[model samples]
Target: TCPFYKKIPGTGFTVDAFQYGVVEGCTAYFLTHFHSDHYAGLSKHFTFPVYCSEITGNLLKNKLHVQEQYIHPLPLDTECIVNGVKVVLLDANHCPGAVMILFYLPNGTVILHTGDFRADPSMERSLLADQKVHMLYLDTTYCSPEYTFPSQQEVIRFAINTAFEAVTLNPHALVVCGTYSIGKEKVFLAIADVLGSKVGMSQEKYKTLQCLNIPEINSLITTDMCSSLVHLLPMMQINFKGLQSHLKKCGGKYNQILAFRPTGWTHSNKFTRIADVIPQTKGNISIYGIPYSEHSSYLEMKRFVQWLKPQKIIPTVNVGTWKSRSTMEKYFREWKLEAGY
Candidate 1:
């Protein structure tokens, strides 16, 4: 977990790059995913021989641009022992490369760390087969009613629809959407599927996308391929005005265009692109409200928790922290919150 609230009650010892204390190596600590909150401190400041899935290590090096040494990457579904801790990797399903961690100690303690996972009842048949799941650290980001949004498939559809409309409505204005390298290819493929024709991309963009030819998930790429979707757009094709000029000159027509790149976004919550564009070059653009998160919705979170059947559950992220017993009761099964209904 990244940036968790800790009082450091003067116990178990704590240390991070931002702070100063004694910490253990991955041989002692277990990492569930490569999210900044979890892996930031490690790859950012320290490389403690992590204990995570193999893809996580690759993403850290290739995607996040981490260059740490002495890494101890674990393969999925394989049991590994680190610092006397036995952890089994399960599919976290939060991102393409994340995994859920199951830690079993010789003392008969089974700790389940569901790192940002969603309810894939489809995965239940497989997960349930494993025995003795005790403590669960659930990612309760969408625990409240506010995050009761639609599913992943729904959001994907909406994003593609919106992008298509942006292209259809404004033929002259250039449209760009997408962050770094996480899910752009799938989105691009979705756009291609909708359009049914080959979409043109820059040479660099095409090369970057080529990395996905035999993608990790074995996912199908979009039939329409852009010549380029590279690491960073050239200065000429960076800003809105520049991008329009670049696209016009790039030699392919696209209704809705997506930037297969990043534009030095400083803030964690906002999205950005190159400067000085006509349609989108006003000042700053914020796309946070569009529900483009990698985490799951409220309903999926609930269903996942229900299937685990743990004696006690801890909602780690939100919807009232571990302190509020009453708040926790609402999520507990068969528990009467206000005399039931």
Candidate 2:
């Protein structure tokens, strides 16, 4: 039996639930983004037809090597009929290819599955703004008040300023930006653009970025490590010990290392100001934990719920524990009451 959260009620669609291995009633499979956690069970041997955004479709082919015949690329903001259900994709604002999936059932139910998204002002102008959502499958990654952090633009600007100051203090300093396979491109890209430095990354990562079809990133890519002071490394490599080893490998080329570990986990309600979010320094290595989150903040999620006023809400993340899920449901009820529904 598929987990209740994975199966969309009143529909034969299972989203981001490939790990369950072919749900019994599932007729169509949908992927919201290219994150590992979302696309965990998908494999080249999988025979089911999968639908996703064009960018994510490209990643499935290049990164996962899924068969072209099974992959279907849907255009953004346009409605398409798949197995009698009217489906539409909207910009998720979380990552390049991420999208909020909208399914209009024949029974007159409008279900909006926000794959994994950051609630921005742009989403307020989407088709969902006016439509009544009967069910909402939300990305509850930071659904608590304690997870309130600054906006993505604000965090990016702060990261740029912080990197600039550190680099200015020491010309031989190496700026490393931690990244996953798909997210946090904006943070590193902004740093490299503002500092006028080339970005160095593994060829595999560069190839994945190429699938995004971003023209600006192409010009900034550098294969030679010596020519680029700003390097993009995996998140695990941003630690003090990891960076210390990296500095030694530089062989006197870079005197010090300044790295930014960007994630929503870094911020909390206790942080009154962005500057108060300090860095962890050990000798010549410094790691700044920047709150560059792709997920929606608590306030953002509340505003979105209040605006949409969906009949039912299901928390996607942090649902493993009953207590966590109930906590999110409490917030949902508060928001619904505030919406006057």
Candidate 3:
């Protein structure tokens, strides 16, 4: 019924919200992260109790302004029986507090909801020990092979190098890295660490980052309109037109505008005439679509599935012709061979 909710059929547990995705009478609701698409309608007025990572709970309270009583802060890797069902939370590694929810049903079936996570190789050991998985709800953001992208470490290195080049190429330009409202703190912090300068973000956005409680990641706030060598802009503000408008409005005080977008889509052959750094320019604003993403690459997704070897799989996102279960079987066999599984 809903695109956002992952309801385990014949069970009361639902993961995520979107009015329709839940069961007719859901027993409990779980949240994976704070990404808007995953948490569209949630707010202080939300009625149902939500189980999520402690950090996510804090964001719900401090950012979304949700009432404390309605929120349930659950620790990752801890299992507890609630409403006659067993539930466990595992770190998703997609963002600050994203998690994968595992459910154990009375019928002895176990289902895992990935919740928009990228593949993390570290989880393989413990997961394999547990052995069986009846179903898997996967994050298929970059499920298509055309969406192949480098690891986060590699992508972050390119972003830093490109920003450093842009800064050196034009000393007076503002080097901005486009990021999601809550995720991608790694890019900003890494840039700051390498440059030995503070990473600046908007006051409101900083409040969300502050909850992470890492001193190295916390930096002095700077407004978008102000002049700063390195500007941390939200992903929404990184589009071609947005950069030009800001540059013009700033009255040419900033000599140039260099924007770096960190996403797997940047690797699309349609955009990539070449891979590492896809460039676009208009007037004084120049954009670099850096091949970076927090989501699993197509190969990584295949590798993850082969490793997990669940009895059945369901993609969380719609991928046109790739949406069918039958199509998944073909993709699996082909990708598994490519993944050396």
Candidate 4:
């Protein structure tokens, strides 16, 4: 199993889930984000108080239904001393309230857990300028060379432009956007602003985005689809099979549908498959797989390692499908050597 916790002996500080046993001897826990995968071992009844960003803290109480007293909201970029460990939180640039955790141990070892992030250049300026990280818990979700993707900013721009052009091409089409239940609010908000129309979503999703407390976000959301030409649905409905049934249910209410699924998986090994269908439509329905991923690509991950110069790179994910521990170590060491580290 991938080690869930990097223990600083006697410091009473732990990062992520250290599921050793009941109670686990952990004095405190720092949750990097509210993603289900990151909070694998935590639950509504979790006894240990979790330190996280403000939005993530609200998610725990409001969305995950955790109690308020067990959640601690920390201001980003501030330093806090917890159980003799100097702690800092940097924006992960992955999702709302996602943060990369930094721990300064008493023995002078600096351990950093990326907690599933993209390599935003600001991160280097903000946290890595003068620091030498002794241990780095890296997000290696796209560790393969084939996963080449553009910057998320460019991708989002492309998606909005494409959406507009697509609708212009088919005057009677409904612009259907697929996004996650919580993430991808920026995409919808941008589309809404560009079209000067409200984006329709489930009330639950609208409530989830409310925790961020951005005025523009709250204003961009709507529950009624008839009010806007563009409708935001769950990401899974971007394919033909899913949209076919949906279209039939609509009883041809709209003449056509332009579907967009913004994700990183569009650049995976199945790129050719997505390429085959993304550009061409099945009759009046067109689907586009936009590359808007929260995680860093292979090139981005490699660049992160080269710039940070961490003494050791630890793969944060321990799932069955990911590359094994030995493989991660070997590749990381080779990349460091290649970078003249």
lDDT, model 2, position 27 = 80
TM-score of 4: 0.88
Evaluated at residue 337, the lDDT of candidate 4 is 84
Query: Where is model 3 more than 4 Å wrong at Cα?
Result: 2-5, 21-23, 168-170, 220-227, 239-241, 248-253, 266-278, 319-326, 333-341
User: Model 3 — TM-score against the truth?
Assistant: 0.85
Instruction: Give the winner by lDDT.
Output: 2
Clashes of each: 12, 0, 3, 0
User: Candidate 3 on 180-213: residue-level lDDT in tens?
Assistant: 6677777766765566567666778767877765
Winner on lDDT between 1 and 3 is 3
- Residue 219, model 4: lDDT of 66
Query: Model 2: per-residue lDDT, tens digit, 1-341?
Result: 66788888777888998887768878888999998988998878978889999999999999999999999999998989998789999999988899999999898889999999988767879888767889999899888887777777788878889889988888889999888768888888899888898799888888898899677766888767878989988888888878887888778899988888887665253656776667777898888877777888888888888878788988888989989978877888888777897
Which 10-residue window of candidate 4 scores lowest in summed lDDT? 267-276
Instruction: Please state the error at residue 108 of candidate 4 in Å.
Output: 1.5
Best by TM-score: 2
Using all chains and alpha carbons, the TM-scores for the candidates as numbered come to 0.64, 0.95, 0.85, 0.88
Task: List runs of model 1 lying over 4 Å from the truth.
Answer: 1-21, 24-26, 44-47, 63-69, 158-175, 180-185, 196-293, 319-330, 333-341
Q: What residue pairs are clashing in model 4?
A: none
What's the distance in Å from true for residue 297, model 3?
1.4
